[PDB]
Design a protein around this ligand. Structure first.
Ligand SMILES: *[C@@H]1O[C@H](CO)[C@@H](O)[C@H](O)[C@H]1NC(C)=O
Ligand SMILES: *[C@@H]1O[C@H](CO)[C@@H](O)[C@H](O)[C@H]1NC(C)=O
Lengths: 42, 619
């Protein structure tokens, strides 16, 4: 699996939170970013 | 026997072990090839030498690419720096070097020190620089940026020198060269038979600077960490007169090319390049790169003809001229293939200044190349310690972006081709760059294991090439842009309240980020599922990956007005950092009209990059 699939759950949580927030998502972003930056595809 | 990565890696390493890089560097310091300013007889002699070597190596094809370009050079009248004390006037120096693209002019006024000439350096001075000449230290930023920063504050000229603390050179009288174009390529020549300075700018020796400081008052701040002789402002009784008379001259430059054709997809290429020209002897500046280029071409050609290496894609070796003037030779080549080069060349590897020391290994690149760099670091040893280069798993979050003086910059920011530059270096700058002391003698004295360090720089570049050309798949890491986009959205998200106040919403930018995310995932899945032996499936997928970098070039600006169109790595009001720099002002230097357009155009560019990652229209 690539990094985007490994980190997909965190992307979904961010989008779900952005969607709530438009009717602060800083943690949901920090989590995704962490997962992306620590993922090594190879 | 079909060769696999392990076999190729071990073959390269074998060939490198017997390679003599220092003999070639030394040959390029012989009298027939120094000095070698662009368009000179000696530059040309070296070009034709490189050409004939490429032929000797039996490359698939070898060719010349010529351009006529206008450079600036010294006039027959000497440039000068003079102290005016009226009742007396005396010469400080007739400098041996110059700064190309200086305005030709004579100015007189106060002299004011501005440290390195950064924007913050100027902000912290107690003396307004308007209507004054400014003196700055070389370093930290380019000459072009120093001049632009001074001009922005209405300075009337700029002097540039090398202080002993940052540039510990025994000879205080040493001259030096650079250029002050805030761009690349030839800024002059119209489209029938621009980042230029409107003030004079001139390099002076340390000795000259010290004579100036003897006419100046005020200690320099200790946090500048410069010499004790440095002073801040001319005395009231004294002014400085700078006279620059540089002239334009048309020259013919030759870029020399050689290719090893790919066995499967010869129409796609990795391009490996090095600057050939230099003011003065240019050992570190041009010699080392050119030596690397020669040895890499020879070794790869031998691997193909003798050892069974069958690269799927082509490998192009490029010896550029007029690099010293702002990557002019390389830029002119790029410009000939506006809009289409990214469909052919999929990566650029710069070899310039790859060996400046031993302590550190540094790399700057498009994020598309980060996985390739990481895997390469895992497989190359440091040339002094013996440790593998990969000793920081968080390296990629620390990389600095390519700068305007690096020949890899226009490939990425203008042409949309993923590019990489790397070096073994120190924390300190190499002191002799741009001087007559940039010789093989000085280089070998500072780095007595120059041959082993050059071997390591060759191994890095060689491994990049093999990885990029061996398999049916392209080793380009498009998913690395998910982190880059997310990081931007994080920076933008600090101004959420400003954005609400203006009646705007980030929904469509968020949504475009998510679209790119899912679109990279889908492309990765498709690679995973593809029949790797089907040359037709793989060519289609790889063609897609080759367009990823290009789709981050803004389609909304002219490359004649803003050549550096890449929204991450480029320059001007269409970049993502520029959007943040404007929005930062709202706490009327802030322009709301500009910001609205910037948000719209960024969002359209990111969304269009996501859509472009889909295969067919019905997907
Ligand atoms: C710099 O600008 C100030 C303020 O406008 C002006 O009074 C002064 O004469 C200028 N200095 C010089 C040296 O031109
Ligand atoms: C603000 O930006 C708009 C659009 O680029 C431009 O037309 C206008 O001149 C700018 N205003 C100022 C004061 O710079």
């Amino acid at each position: 699996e690539g990094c985007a699939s490994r980190c997909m759950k965190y992307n979904d949580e961010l989008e779900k939170c952005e969607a709530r927030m438009m009717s602060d998502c800083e943690q949901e972003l920090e989590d995704l970013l962490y997962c992306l930056d620590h993922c090594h595809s190879q | 026997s079909r060769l696999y990565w392990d076999d190729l890696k071990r073959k390269l390493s074998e060939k490198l072990d017997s390679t003599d890089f220092t003999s070639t560097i030394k040959l390029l310091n012989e009298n027939s090839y120094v000095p070698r300013e662009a368009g000179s007889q000696k530059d040309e002699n070296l070009a034709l030498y490189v050409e004939n070597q490429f032929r000797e190596f039996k490359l698939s094809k070898v060719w010349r690419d010529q351009h006529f370009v206008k450079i600036q050079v010294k006039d027959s009248a000497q440039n000068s720096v003079i102290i005016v004390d009226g009742r007396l006037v005396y010469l400080v120096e007739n400098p041996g070097g110059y700064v190309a693209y200086s305005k030709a002019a004579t100015v007189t006024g106060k002299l004011v020190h501005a440290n390195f000439g950064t924007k913050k350096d100027f902000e912290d001075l107690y003396t307004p620089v308007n209507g004054s000449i400014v003196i700055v230290r070389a370093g930290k930023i380019t000459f072009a940026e120093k001049v632009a920063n001074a001009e922005s504050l209405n300075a009337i000229g700029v002097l540039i020198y090398m202080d002993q603390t940052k540039f510990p050179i025994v000879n205080a009288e040493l001259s030096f060269f650079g250029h002050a174009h805030l761009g690349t390529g030839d800024p002059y020549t119209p489209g029938f038979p621009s980042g230029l300075p409107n003030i004079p700018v001139q390099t002076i020796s340390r000795a000259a600077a010290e004579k100036l400081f003897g006419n100046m008052e005020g200690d320099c701040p200790s946090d500048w960490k410069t010499d004790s002789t440095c002073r801040m402002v001319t005395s009231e009784s004294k002014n400085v007169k700078l006279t620059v008379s540089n002239v334009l001259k048309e020259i013919k430059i030759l870029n020399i090319f050689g290719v090893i054709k790919g066995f499967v997809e010869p129409d796609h290429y990795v391009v490996v390049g090095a600057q050939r020209d230099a003011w003065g002897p240019g050992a570190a500046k041009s010699g080392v790169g050119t030596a690397l280029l020669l040895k890499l071409a020879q070794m790869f050609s031998d691997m193909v003809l003798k050892d069974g290496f069958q690269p799927s894609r082509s490998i192009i070796f490029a010896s550029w001229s007029a690099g010293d003037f702002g990557s002019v030779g390389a830029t002119e080549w790029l410009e000939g293939y506006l809009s289409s080069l990214h469909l052919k060349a999929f990566t650029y590897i710069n070899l310039d200044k790859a060996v400046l020391g031993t302590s550190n290994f540094k790399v700057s690149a498009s994020p598309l190349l980060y996985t390739l760099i990481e895997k390469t670091m895992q497989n190359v040893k440091h040339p002094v310690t013996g440790q593998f280069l990969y000793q920081d798993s968080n390296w990629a979050s620390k990389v600095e972006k390519l700068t305007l003086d690096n020949a890899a910059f226009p490939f990425l920011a203008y042409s949309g081709i993923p590019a990489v530059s790397f070096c073994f270096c120190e924390d300190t700058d190499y002191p002799y760059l741009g001087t007559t002391m940039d010789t093989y003698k000085e280089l070998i004295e500072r780095i007595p294991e120059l041959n082993k360090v050059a071997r390591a720089a060759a191994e890095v570049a060689g491994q990049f090439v093999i990885k990029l050309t061996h398999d049916v798949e392209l080793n380009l890491d498009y998913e690395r842009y998910n982190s880059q986009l997310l990081s931007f959205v994080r920076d933008l998200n600090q101004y959420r309240a400003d954005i609400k106040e203006m009646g705007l919403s980030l929904q469509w930018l968020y949504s475009a980020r998510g679209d790119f995310f899912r679109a990279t995932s889908r492309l990765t899945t498709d690679f995973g599922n593809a029949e790797k032996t089907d040359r037709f499936v793989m060519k289609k997928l790889n063609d897609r990956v080759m367009r990823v970098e290009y789709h981050f070039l803004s389609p909304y600006v002219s490359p004649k007005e803003s050549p550096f169109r890449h929204v991450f790595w480029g320059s001007g009001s269409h970049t993502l950092p520029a959007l943040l720099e404007n929005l930062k002002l709202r706490k009327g230097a802030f322009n709301e009209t500009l910001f609205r357009n910037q948000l719209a155009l960024a969002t359209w560019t990111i969304q269009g990059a996501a859509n472009a990652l889909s295969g067919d229209v019905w997907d």
